[PDB]
Design a protein around this ligand. Sequence first.
Ligand SMILES: NC(=O)c1ccc[n+]([C@@H]2O[C@H](COP(=O)([O-])OP(=O)(O)OC[C@H]3O[C@@H](n4cnc5c(N)ncnc54)[C@H](OP(=O)(O)O)[C@@H]3O)[C@@H](O)[C@H]2O)c1
Ligand SMILES: NC(=O)c1ccc[n+]([C@@H]2O[C@H](COP(=O)([O-])OP(=O)(O)OC[C@H]3O[C@@H](n4cnc5c(N)ncnc54)[C@H](OP(=O)(O)O)[C@@H]3O)[C@@H](O)[C@H]2O)c1
Ligand code: NA
Ligand code: NA
Lengths: 319, 318
Amino acid sequence: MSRPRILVPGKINPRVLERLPEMFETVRIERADAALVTADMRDVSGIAVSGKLPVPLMDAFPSLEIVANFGVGYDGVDVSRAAARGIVVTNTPDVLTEEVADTAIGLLLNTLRLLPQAEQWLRQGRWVREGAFPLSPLSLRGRTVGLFGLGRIGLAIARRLEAFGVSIAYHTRTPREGLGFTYHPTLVGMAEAVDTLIVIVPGTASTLKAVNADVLSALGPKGVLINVGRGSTVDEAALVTALQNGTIAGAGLDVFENEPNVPEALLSFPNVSLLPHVASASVVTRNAMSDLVVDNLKAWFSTGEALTPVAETPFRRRA
Amino acid sequence: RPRILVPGKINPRVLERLPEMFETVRIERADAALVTADMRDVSGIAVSGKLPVPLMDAFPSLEIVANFGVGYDGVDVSRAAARGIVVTNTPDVLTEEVADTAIGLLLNTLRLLPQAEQWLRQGRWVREGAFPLSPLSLRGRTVGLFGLGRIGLAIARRLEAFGVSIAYHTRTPREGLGFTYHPTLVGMAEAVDTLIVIVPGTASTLKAVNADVLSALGPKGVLINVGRGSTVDEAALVTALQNGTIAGAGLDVFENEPNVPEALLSFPNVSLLPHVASASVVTRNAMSDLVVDNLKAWFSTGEALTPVAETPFRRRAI
Ligand SMILES: NC(=O)c1ccc[n+]([C@@H]2O[C@H](COP(=O)([O-])OP(=O)(O)OC[C@H]3O[C@@H](n4cnc5c(N)ncnc54)[C@H](OP(=O)(O)O)[C@@H]3O)[C@@H](O)[C@H]2O)c1
Ligand SMILES: NC(=O)c1ccc[n+]([C@@H]2O[C@H](COP(=O)([O-])OP(=O)(O)OC[C@H]3O[C@@H](n4cnc5c(N)ncnc54)[C@H](OP(=O)(O)O)[C@@H]3O)[C@@H](O)[C@H]2O)c1
Ligand code: NA
Ligand code: NA
């Protein structure tokens, strides 16, 4: 009744750890690994986690009620298996929307105008010896942007893009009514129509390698791909080929198939910007994400209703 | 065919198009000592950057200086006006491009994206894990625009979509816009935490961003300069960054380009670009076209396309 025990496997923002003592006992393990679970941990009622939650770790806890996922994406939790056990899963929507949308525009501008490379040119002393940084072959001016995904974050990206004077289209499974953006019922169809593709869908079975050779070919030789969603959504091998052959003109990636590993071939290109999954990674936004993780757990145990349960687990607490 | 002097470096598109109507005369530096007796019939100049007065005054038949760039502080416009010489610039065709760079630089300064990319490229994501969280963010910021002209307004339009508060300082307020006007720069700096400089480099803006303005901007303060480097007291900025008087800075322009002081290079909270705000192929092509089309319009019709405010002149031949 009094204090529930919460497991935290691996690294998490210290703000989560700082706030859990408001209601909970915290149990830490150094890695998300079932082999680290001891007999004394079998009474754990909740998990707070960033990234992967292996099924054998989740299933090591007979009294588990709730997984509070740090992040709006929760593809590291086996939600099917959670639902089958009656375990509620919560995520962190909304509190990071604007931050992520800001990073998406930054990455887009860096990709098109080569601003990081320009800064390196200056910092390495090349402005003095060799003169002006080369003119960027690309620009945002005159571009047509297609958003793959138009949810919380996709719409926030579209709102920014409206102020840059570019045409905007989108592809989702179901159109969003009331908005003045051109809907495309197929991804490849949108890709044909646009020269700039921004990926902001979840990493599910339905989006797995959706950005493939055909979509990239359709995007075309002025084509720029921006991925701020999940790396699984892009066929990473096909992207490398497309960049090698000049099938597309450039790419900016915050996410990858097998993080933190980025293939050497992607690192070679002068027309590519790469970030280590930083789209929400400010102090203020990660603090808000931490707060929402903890407030989800507090709401669950005190009222029986989570703040932001995921669609797959619209559960209420039975105790 | 009028003879056009081009001193020093210019976009090859200018040089490609001048033969449509003109004879081109090249000198390798903007230096009067390189002018020969044969060049004394030159009717026009096309120039990027500085045009020294002794070079300008080496040409008795000079009619027009077509400046490459919307900024024309490298031309002595007072002396040009006193000789009846029209000066043209390249407004409008670079406005959106420059506004794009201003936002890019702002985001890079706040979120440390270039440094995050370096962390990845140097193999640190694999060995040491996540790039450190950026202490700063755009979220919750209040932006003050020093200058709100063609480019300043285009920047404000972008910022409106980022959900930040917007204020501005100009000598005269702009009516009809919903942004908070400040009659003094220091007053705006007190009210905001993010200062974007987009004024021309004139006597009136010279070191306007000084120790007092930076102190007023405050310890969460971020300075972005995409105007001219002369507008910022570069020495005072270095001191302010050293002392923690402000939180960060993003600079596209500097007091003595291409030289950037070593102290500015040292800071982890600073983004630096080599004057790239308009430097795309498409935008520089449009700037080149406008330089040439100004000269063509002047010599064919007697009316320039984009003369500067100081020289609202029409051609008198002979
Ligand atoms: N880089 C980062 O650090 C970072 C940060 C935050 C989020 N993210 C990623 O961004 C994702 C989206 O976040 P959000 O808050 O915007 O979520 P959201 O509000 O649920 O939006 C998801 C969008 O994707 C669309 N979608 C899903 N499956 C689709 C499919 N198979 N085909 C076409 N459209 C599809 C949805 O429309 P329909 O359902 O109608 O198809 C919806 O428009 C997260 O799941 C996360 O993986 C990454
Ligand atoms: N980094 C780059 O590559 C790059 C590219 C393009 C332009 N620029 C620079 O940006 C400048 C602005 O371009 P623009 O097309 O926006 O020019 P603009 O349309 O003439 O706008 C200039 C703005 O500055 C204000 N201003 C001028 N002197 C001022 C003073 N002493 N105090 C306060 N406000 C002052 C003007 O308002 P008031 O007259 O009412 O004071 C006006 O709002 C250029 O002159 C150039 O130096 C740099
Ligand atoms: Na296309
Ligand atoms: Na302030």
